[PDB]
């Protein structure tokens, strides 16, 4: 299942409600093509990996999340688990989400 | 509007 974070309040709550499954966040931009261009993958994994939690963040309308995460390049994939960070990587690499997810799965 | 920094999606290389 996916989860949209419109405020830092929903950010921490997303990790808390995420249970203990892996959690990948997509810091993209709905107005930016190159960022949303990777949605047919990250968001698609929602059906191929129903055992993984996927989040979404608007680096422009939710600058509070990007601010605390100091994001300077989109899309930025960040991995969280039980509210703790384990790894992260930016750069359009949808195939990497698979290898990274299967890594900390 | 909603603009911030560069989107290095399939734009980088």
Swiss-Prot record, chain A:
CDD domains: TRX_family. Disulfide bonds join 32-35. Changing residue 70 to A: Strongly reduced interaction with CASP3. The record marks 33-34 as: Contributes to redox potential value. Residues 2-105 form the Thioredoxin domain. The modification N6-succinyllysine is found at residues 8, 94. Keywords: Acetylation, Activator, Allergen, Cytoplasm, Disulfide bond, Electron transport, Nucleus, Redox-active center, S-nitrosylation, Secreted, Transcription, Transcription regulation, Transport, Ubl conjugation. One of its GO terms (biological process) is cellular detoxification of hydrogen peroxide. In case of infection, ubiquitinated by S.typhimurium protein slrP, leading to its degradation. The modification N6-acetyllysine is found at residues 3, 39, 94. GO terms for cellular component: cytoplasm; cytosol; extracellular exosome; extracellular region; nucleoplasm; nucleus. Induction: Up-regulated by ionizing radiation. InterPro entries: Thioredoxin, Thioredoxin-like_sf, Thioredoxin_CS, Thioredoxin_domain. The record marks 26 as: Deprotonates C-terminal active site Cys. It comes from the Eukaryota. The active site is at residues 32, 35. The modification S-nitrosocysteine is found at residues 62, 69, 73. Signal peptide: none annotated. Participates in various redox reactions through the reversible oxidation of its active center dithiol to a disulfide and catalyzes dithiol-disulfide exchange reactions. Plays a role in the reversible S-nitrosylation of cysteine residues in target proteins, and thereby contributes to the response to intracellular nitric oxide. Nitrosylates the active site Cys of CASP3 in response to nitric oxide (NO), and thereby inhibits caspase-3 activity. Belongs to the thioredoxin family. Homodimer; disulfide-linked. Interacts with TXNIP through the redox-active site. Interacts with MAP3K5 and CASP3. In case of infection, interacts with S.typhimurium protein slrP. Interacts with APEX1; the interaction stimulates the FOS/JUN AP-1 DNA-binding activity in a redox-dependent manner. This is Thioredoxin. It comes from Homo sapiens (Human). The lineage of its organism: Eukaryota, Metazoa, Chordata, Craniata, Vertebrata. The gene is TXN.
Curated annotation (Swiss-Prot), chain B:
A lipid is attached at residue 7 (S-(15-deoxy-Delta12,14-prostaglandin J2-9-yl)cysteine). The modification S-nitrosocysteine is found at residue 7. It comes from the Eukaryota. It is found in: Nucleus; Cytoplasm. Constitutes the active form, which associates with RELA/p65 to form the NF-kappa-B p65-p50 complex to form a transcription factor. Together with RELA/p65, binds to the kappa-B consensus sequence 5'-GGRNNYYCC-3', located in the enhancer region of genes involved in immune response and acute phase reactions. This is Nuclear factor NF-kappa-B p50 subunit. The gene is NFKB1.
């Amino acid at each position: 299942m996916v989860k949209q974070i419109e405020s830092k309040t929903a950010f921490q709550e997303a990790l808390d409600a995420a249970g203990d499954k892996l959690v990948v966040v997509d810091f993209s931009a709905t107005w930016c093509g190159p960022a949303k261009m990777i949605k047919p993958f990250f968001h698609s994994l929602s059906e191929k990996y129903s055992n993984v939690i996927f989040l979404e963040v608007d680096v422009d309308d939710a600058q509070d999340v990007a601010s605390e995460a100091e994001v300077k390049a989109t899309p930025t994939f960040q991995f969280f688990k039980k509210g703790q960070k384990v790894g992260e990587f930016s750069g359009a690499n949808k195939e990497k989400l698979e290898a990274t997810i299967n890594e900390l799965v | 509007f909603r603009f911030r920094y560069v989107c290095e999606g399939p734009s980088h290389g």
